[PDB]
Amino acid sequence: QLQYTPQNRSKDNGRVVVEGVGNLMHHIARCCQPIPGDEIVGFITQGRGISVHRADCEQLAELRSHAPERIVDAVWGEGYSLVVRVVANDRSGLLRDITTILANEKVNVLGVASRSDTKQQLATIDMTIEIYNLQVLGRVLGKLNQVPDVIDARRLH
Amino acid sequence: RSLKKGPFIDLHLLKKVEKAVESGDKKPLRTWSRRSTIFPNMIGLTIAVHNGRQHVPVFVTDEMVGHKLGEFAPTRTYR
Amino acid sequence: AKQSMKAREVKRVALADKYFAKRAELKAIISDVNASDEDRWNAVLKLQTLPRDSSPSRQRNRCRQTGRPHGFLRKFGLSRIKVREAAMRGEIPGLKKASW
Amino acid sequence: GQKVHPNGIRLGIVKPWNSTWFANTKEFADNLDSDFKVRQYLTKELAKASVSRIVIERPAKSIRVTIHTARPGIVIGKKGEDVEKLRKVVADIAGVPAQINIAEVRKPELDAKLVADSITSQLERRVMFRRAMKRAVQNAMRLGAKGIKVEVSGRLGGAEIARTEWYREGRVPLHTLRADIDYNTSEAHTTYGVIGVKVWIFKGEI
Amino acid sequence: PRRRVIGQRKILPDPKFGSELLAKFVNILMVDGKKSTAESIVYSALETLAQRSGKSELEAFEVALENVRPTVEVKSRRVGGSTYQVPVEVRPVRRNALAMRWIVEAARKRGDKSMALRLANELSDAAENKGTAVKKREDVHRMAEANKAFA
RNA sequence: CGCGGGGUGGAGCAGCCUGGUAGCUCGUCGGGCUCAUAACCCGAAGGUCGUCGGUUCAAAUCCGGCCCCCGCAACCA
RNA sequence: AGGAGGUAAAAAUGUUCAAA
RNA sequence: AAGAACCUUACCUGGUCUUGACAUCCACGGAAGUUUUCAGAGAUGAGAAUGUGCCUUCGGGAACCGUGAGACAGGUGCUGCAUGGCUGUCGUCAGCUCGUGUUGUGAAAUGUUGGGUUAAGUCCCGCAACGAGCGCAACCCUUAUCCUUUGUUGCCAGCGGUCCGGCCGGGAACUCAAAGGAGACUGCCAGUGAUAAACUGGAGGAAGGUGGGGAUGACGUCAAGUCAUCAUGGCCCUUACGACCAGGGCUACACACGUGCUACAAUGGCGCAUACAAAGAGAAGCGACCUCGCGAGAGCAAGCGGACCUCAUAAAGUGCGUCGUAGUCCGGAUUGGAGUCUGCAACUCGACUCCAUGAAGUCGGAAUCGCUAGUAAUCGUGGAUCAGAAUGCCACGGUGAAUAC
């Protein structure tokens, strides 16, 4: 029910400075989820301007095998938006266990990417978010690797 | 269609281009001239035409010439 | 309307006469079929050098009193509101309400 | 609201245009605006001298200026002193010699404008409006005007809601074209704001 | 009018034949100001009628014109309060007038090549009172009959 | 435990019985009349036919299980 | 003018307070 | 909104300035102006040549420039239910009032009601009403007939000359042009009507009972609209809701609606030929003619700031021929290509041309609109706005009905 504001505010920009200049139309790609820290590598799509693909990655490398010349460099100016996989044992209110932590833990909860099937007692749950502060990322990983049903809860890439 | 003589452009960009020419296809341009036509000696350049708020980039290719820059930076966003 | 606008307009008039008034020549004889050489190109390229305004198309032309951009009459230089406002007063020479 | 301006509808009948002259679009609007300029400037430095109407004539590059006032003696300063002071500042605003003619009107209550601002003057004094109206009215009627009618609108007295009032005496045939219905206005500023003042005066015909 | 019992507009009779009624018949076909063409269409139809009829025209027309001319009409006057039909004697002016209106009417339909020609066919069919025009008049006759109960 | 009936547009009912092509009423929507609303008038969309599986070339329909809903029964004990 | 007989189916509703 | 590419522009994004784009006052330095280079999107910012003139009672001069400080300045910020001016409107509807008098305790009434009549509280008459005022009418403009005036760039019969073109002498009758007047008054007669108004018919008359049209819009209503034309009381912001600039937007597009254009055709399209207007507009404007281009236009270049010059062969219509009822030679949207003009500039977003392309549409549900006369209808011409940008608005004539018992 809580599932625009980012694209309306990423338009506020200042978030990327491409080869010495910002203000260029751009967007973080869905195949890397670039994070503020370890810079990036940018590619120029025909329309929709620059397509950042996070520094070092295959699809970005595939482009190198087509029009590598178009590819460009940039930084971050000023950890919004990312996904996290939390494959875990069964559930038993575990869906609450993720959320229980997340609640007033603050961070955005638009990553309704769960998938409970497999063969064994191991539901595959994923979560895209739009966490703000980089420090917040760390507290989550410590508070989410802990969970008993959880066997893995870290930066999906 | 328009202007019988002299595929028009604004000078500041012309020199901006020339400067980039001898300099080589490098860092993207800061042109605000959507009105300027695209001369052949601009191919490969990753110039970024202003867009009223955005300054969207465009990777010039041969065909992108007689066509004015504005055409590659749509203004209005829809749906 | 907004003293700034009117001042902006007269600024346009100033730059208007200051240049093209005797430097419309560029697009004139130089942007002509006689010297299609780089010279004509010099014309089309030096024209921009001239301050954006000055060029007559950039003379919005307002009412001489109220300054309302719309409904201006090139004739009296007054916006319909004022031209009427004065015409009734008996201001404008020979200008009674027509009745043909 | 919708009543035609009395002064306008009779221009080709009785009321002479206040600014007689001639020109062409090539130099018309200029003469019209400057005309307004001098009339404006005088409006300023003559409002204290009770001007009635400033007729302007534009003959042979020259700018003549007939001035109707009830008190020429104050308009003239001293031996044409302030008069010429005006012709200076006038031709200064026209870049052309101005023959400043001053004509006295000797029936101060028989003009619309004068009476009008007589009222605004009174509202400026903060005198109760109605007294002022009935005042000017009786003055006119006893001064021979076959007709008179005045109106005031706005806060008047500072009412929460604006009103409108009017008195009349004698015939004022606004539809009878030949009727010489003088008509003038003079907005009256007050602490609560602007307040309308209009005055009709009927005298003759043909 | 609610009042102005205005006198009627006198007209300008036909330039070709002498009938003023002919001219009127031109008018009730004259779309816009193309009165020239309307007139063209008129004489044409009369010419061709005079052909197959073999007769005159000034009167080869009336034997056809009479056929559709109404005898009585049914204006919906509503005496009493509630509304119903009421037959009434038709005025001679409105008689031949409305008659022409109908002829031209069926003529506007049943379009062939020429307007004039399809109309020629009409007037013929009217002479044999079998045109659609008379059928229209016949309809008015039935409305007269069924409502002949009223006055 | 038992026997019978039903689940169809947002609501109520058809149509199933006897295989191919689902209609009615209100309701929703679009326009009109009205100062405005309703009413009224014009026009329009809307239903994977409970779910799964089966039978068949084809299943709203034939057949079986499942979930729902109602009915009749649960006697001598 | 003295008098009699004939004369219109259906058509609901309008939030609260408010000025010399 | 009598015309959004920029400008406009008030909005957005971004980059910018603060006593400032606009105003005075004080002081400080300084002609103002002129030219030119870089950077920048531009604004601006940074350098550099040049200029440095009439009071010289000479801090000096007016001006103007830039600088400093502050009074201030700026606001298209809200508030039309704080306002003025202005406007629609009911509605060109004939109504709406007042004086004194009178009636009634009074709210009020009578006047204005009544019998007639009128487009009308228009008019006559009667009446506890008598008069007056706003309004009706009329006075104004336009238009219709005639006379006078004067005769170009107008017109040109009759005269003479003709390259039969008012082209040329020449003409003031004529068209016409404006100026001045005549004329129409229910004035004449018949009739009706209370010896009244007036209505009905005719005579004459260009014109007939307000001839046609316009102008002019009562007391007021809706606290209608506009505080964004303006002006204004409040309030509100004032290193920002102010000021500059660039790009953008006001042109978005599943959808709904008002007002229009253009069609669905055969009284029509198309082709060739061909006749007949009025109204206007025009100077950093209208722009002949001639040449080039398929054309929009281009080059060249008279005339004109105008009864002469230019826009400028009006179109329907007319004659002849064709298409022959099909989505068809109808339709012209859409779309590609190639262009022209405007203007720093035409992608968002102009107009117009050419080649091609060639959709919906075969007279439209319920419903509903205008219109009685040169109107409806149909046809084209023009103008303000305007660099450019009408299917809108405004204006002009052409053609030309039906019907109203």
PDB file of C-alpha atoms (C1' of nucleotides) in Angstrom, chain F residues 30-33 40-43, chain H residues 257-258 364-368:
ATOM      1  C1'   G F  30     -20.353   9.280 -21.545  1.00  0.00           C
ATOM      2  C1'   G F  31     -23.852  13.265 -23.624  1.00  0.00           C
ATOM      3  C1'   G F  32     -28.815  16.024 -23.117  1.00  0.00           C
ATOM      4  C1'   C F  33     -33.059  18.720 -20.504  1.00  0.00           C
ATOM      5  C1'   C F  40     -36.648  11.690 -17.469  1.00  0.00           C
ATOM      6  C1'   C F  41     -34.192  11.278 -23.021  1.00  0.00           C
ATOM      7  C1'   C F  42     -29.733   9.572 -26.138  1.00  0.00           C
ATOM      8  C1'   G F  43     -25.452   6.491 -26.179  1.00  0.00           C
TER       9        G F  43
ATOM     10  C1'   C H 257     -17.334  20.626 -23.643  1.00  0.00           C
ATOM     11  C1'   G H 258     -18.414  25.942 -26.000  1.00  0.00           C
ATOM     12  C1'   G H 364     -25.197  13.286 -38.249  1.00  0.00           C
ATOM     13  C1'   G H 365     -28.782  10.434 -31.386  1.00  0.00           C
ATOM     14  C1'   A H 366     -31.090  12.862 -27.526  1.00  0.00           C
ATOM     15  C1'   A H 367     -30.915  17.766 -27.823  1.00  0.00           C
ATOM     16  C1'   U H 368     -30.482  22.505 -29.602  1.00  0.00           C
TER      17        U H 368
END
